Design a protein around this ligand. Structure first.
Ligand SMILES: CCCCCC[C@@H](Sc1nc2ccc(NS(=O)(=O)c3ccc(Cl)cc3Cl)cc2s1)C(=O)O
Length: 260
């Protein structure tokens, strides 16, 4: 279109609203993370866990302790996403079973999207920017726990190459949540209508925000495929440890989601 009219103004207002919700819902944004990660004289300096010795210092089997850290964080992450979901124009207006469904099947895609914010070539920022854990350390975890994040790193470096900002991600995450094709949705049409509008919002945001890159919209939409594969892969990984590791157990609120 390339026209500043009433429809385009609404799409900006929607972009602004989602951004503001995202800032309120999500405490460590991408902008902060990038700043910390690039040594942009952010308030304090995270402790770098690169081995067993460095981990014991910072922690002021490990494979189990770290795995249980990632489930605890995963739980809070769902709070954050629940709160953001509820800020999306038309969302609370939907059947409760649909709302609950969209989140059942959304939260992991969103989790692995946001985790990319915390990652570079070297590793991931942990506990709101106070720690950094290396990729090679996480790989070196006792099998099969060395296998979990490697694929998220592989996703992230591809994803981070798109160079999206918090304003981009805000709309993107909304688009993901309102996915018409989740199992056992009563009313598809109303969800698809919100997503069509979110997709208009995104296409506009990207055009305005990314002069120097085309088929960014498309390359971004393709990422939703990579996200599905990552979640699928992640589940077949959770499946295996439940057999092998018949000595531990996994937070029940996650178990509700992890059987469908
Ligand atoms: C203090 C212990 C450090 C870990 C805590 C997690 C960090 S951020 C974070 N958040 C999630 C959320 C999900 C995942 N899923 S995952 O990548 O497949 C994964 C990688 C390794 C292991 Cl051992 C298990 C798992 Cl599930 C990982 C992470 S890492 C935080 O701020 O607290």
């Amino acid at each position: 279109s390339m026209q500043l009219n009433p429809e385009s103004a609404d799409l900006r207002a929607l972009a602004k609203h989602l951004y503001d919700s995202y800032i309120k819902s999500f405490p460590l944004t991408k902008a902060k993370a990038r700043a910390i990660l690039t040594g942009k004289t952010t308030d304090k300096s995270p402790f770098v866990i690169y081995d067993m010795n460095s981990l014991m210092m910072g922690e002021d089997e490990v494979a189990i302790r770290i795995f249980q850290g990632c489930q605890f964080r995963s739980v809070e992450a769902v709070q954050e996403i629940t709160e953001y979901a509820k800020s999306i124009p038309g969302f609370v207006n939907l059947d409760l079973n649909d709302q609950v469904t969209l989140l059942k099947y959304g939260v992991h895609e969103i989790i692995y999207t946001m985790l990319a914010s915390l990652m570079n070539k070297d590793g991931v920022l942990i506990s709101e920017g106070q720690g950094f854990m290396t990729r090679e350390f996480l790989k070196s975890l006792r099998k099969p726990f060395g296998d979990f994040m490697e694929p998220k790193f592989e996703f992230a470096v591809k994803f981070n190459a798109l160079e999206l900002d918090d304003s981009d991600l805000a709309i993107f995450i909304a688009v993901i949540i309102l996915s018409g094709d989740r199992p056992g949705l009563l009313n598809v049409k109303p969800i698809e209508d919100i997503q069509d509008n979110l997709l208009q919002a995104l296409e506009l945001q990207l055009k305005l925000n990314h002069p120097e890159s085309s088929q960014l919209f498309a390359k971004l939409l393709q990422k939703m495929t990579d996200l599905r594969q990552i979640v699928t892969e992640h589940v077949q990984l959770l499946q295996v440890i439940k057999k092998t590791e018949t000595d531990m157990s996994l937070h029940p609120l996650l178990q509700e989601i992890y059987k469908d």
